[PDB]
């Protein structure tokens, strides 16, 4: 029997513990395609499977949840992933959108420009990034840890993610960052999730579940990305869109997670344990204010 009825496949724990050297990625199923339901675009399918997978973790879901979505624009000028996020998230969830280029979106607010121009006053409960630069897919250069928007994402997580909050960040064979992997060790749980509908690609979502302040595990990011490529190279994932046909349990369960503003070494071992089970968010609940920097001539 199969993972073909799952939304996707998560990196098994034994692969996280290896010490592999980086290899070229060579997917057995490179040219396969799932058969999408009629008229459904790949990005809708892909975000739906990510959300179906997130439904199985211990996400903190407060009242007045705050979600920010980077890399939300598409080359068609609409935002299919944030339409899926808005469908998944409880009604009334505050959802902010951003992309390099102009696009039309269902978010409550949209910032256009380089993510490095984006500032927010407050902390967030859930950060989704689909940011990707296709020019990183070059097989004639050594595959090194990438900077660019990954430097911003790492800083944004460390400064603007509430304790207890969660993260899902798109990576690929060539689009990755060693510090992002090291940051996954500051969550109560982490994985690399491959959606079944796009399993012919080296794309995965790095998912960090329940942010703690501190390193829980020490993770070497260069080794961990090598472990990820090794996993993908030796475990063909069958392309599948089966999970897209059962949406009866899709919306994220509204759990009313408690929100508290603690400070400093008020973070008891009891507090950390509540964070780790998805039962606590630590941040303020002021107004949400955002802005982008505008450079003048």
């Amino acid at each position: 029997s199969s993972q073909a009825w799952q939304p996707g496949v998560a990196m098994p724990n034994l692969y996280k513990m290896q010490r592999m050297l980086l290899e070229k990625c060579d997917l057995q199923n490179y040219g396969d395609s799932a058969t999408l339901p009629k008229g459904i675009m790949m990005n809708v399918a892909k975000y739906t499977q990510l959300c179906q997978y997130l439904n199985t973790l211990t996400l903190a879901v407060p009242y007045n949840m705050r979600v920010i979505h980077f890399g939300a624009g598409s080359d068609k000028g609409v935002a299919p992933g944030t339409a899926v996020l808005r469908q998944w998230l409880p009604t009334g969830t505050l959802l902010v959108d951003s992309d390099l280029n102009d696009f039309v979106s269902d978010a409550d607010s949209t910032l256009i420009g380089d993510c490095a121009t984006v500032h927010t006053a407050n902390k967030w409960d859930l950060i989704i990034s689909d940011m990707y630069d296709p020019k990183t897919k070059n097989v004639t250069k050594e595959n090194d840890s990438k900077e660019g928007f990954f430097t911003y994402i790492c800083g944004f997580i460390q400064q603007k993610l509430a304790l207890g909050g969660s993260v899902a960040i798109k990576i690929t064979e060539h689009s990755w960052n060693a510090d992002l992997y090291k940051l996954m060790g500051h969550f109560a749980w982490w994985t690399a999730f491959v959606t079944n509908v796009n399993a012919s690609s080296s794309e995965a979502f790095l998912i960090g579940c329940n942010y703690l302040g501190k390193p829980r595990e020490q993770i070497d990011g260069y080794v961990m990305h090598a472990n990820y490529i090794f996993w993908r190279n030796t475990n063909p994932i069958q392309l599948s869109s089966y999970s897209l046909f059962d949406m009866s349990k899709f919306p994220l369960k509204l759990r009313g997670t408690a929100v508290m503003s603690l400070k400093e070494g008020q973070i008891n071992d009891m507090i950390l344990s509540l964070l780790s089970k998805g039962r606590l968010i630590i941040r303020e609940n002021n107004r949400v204010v955002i802005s982008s920097d505008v450079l003048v001539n």
């Binding site: 339901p37 008229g39 459904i40 675009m41 809708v44 399918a45 739906t48 068609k76 000028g77 609409v78 935002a79 299919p80 339409a83 899926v84 808005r86 469908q87 009604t91 102009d102 039309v104 979106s105 269902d106 978010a107 409550d108 897209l244 949406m247 009866s248 899709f250 919306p251």
Partner: protein, 113 residues
């Protein structure tokens, strides 16, 4: 007195045989929903498709001001249900049709008042 009439321009482009605005965002759902026209979450019944609202506003898609004093889009952030037989032109369908203000359904495609 001058104002750009984007709705009329689109209606006439369609009558001339233009390819309707593409890439409206069709959602996955159970197709067991209330069937109402514009909703907070996808509500298509067995004879409807649900679309993300912003990707079906002419004004939104064309980067044109919305036609009312306080430029407000009643589609953005919502989901719009389109009969499957019209779902090749969701932008057109929402322009040319009206929501029953008591029923919630499209007049002519659901309101039974």
């Amino acid at each position: 007195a001058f104002a750009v009439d984007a709705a009329k321009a689109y209606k006439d482009y369609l009558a001339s045989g233009g390819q309707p605005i593409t890439n409206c965002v069709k959602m996955l759902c159970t197709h067991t929903g209330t069937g109402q026209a514009i909703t907070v979450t996808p509500e298509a019944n067995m004879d409807q498709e649900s679309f993300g609202g912003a990707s079906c506003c002419l004004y939104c898609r064309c980067h044109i001001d919305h036609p009312n004093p306080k430029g407000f889009c009643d589609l953005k952030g919502k989901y719009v249900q389109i009969p499957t037989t019209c779902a090749n032109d969701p932008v057109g369908f929402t322009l040319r049709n009206t929501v029953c203000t008591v029923c919630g359904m499209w007049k002519g495609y659901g309101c039974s008042c």
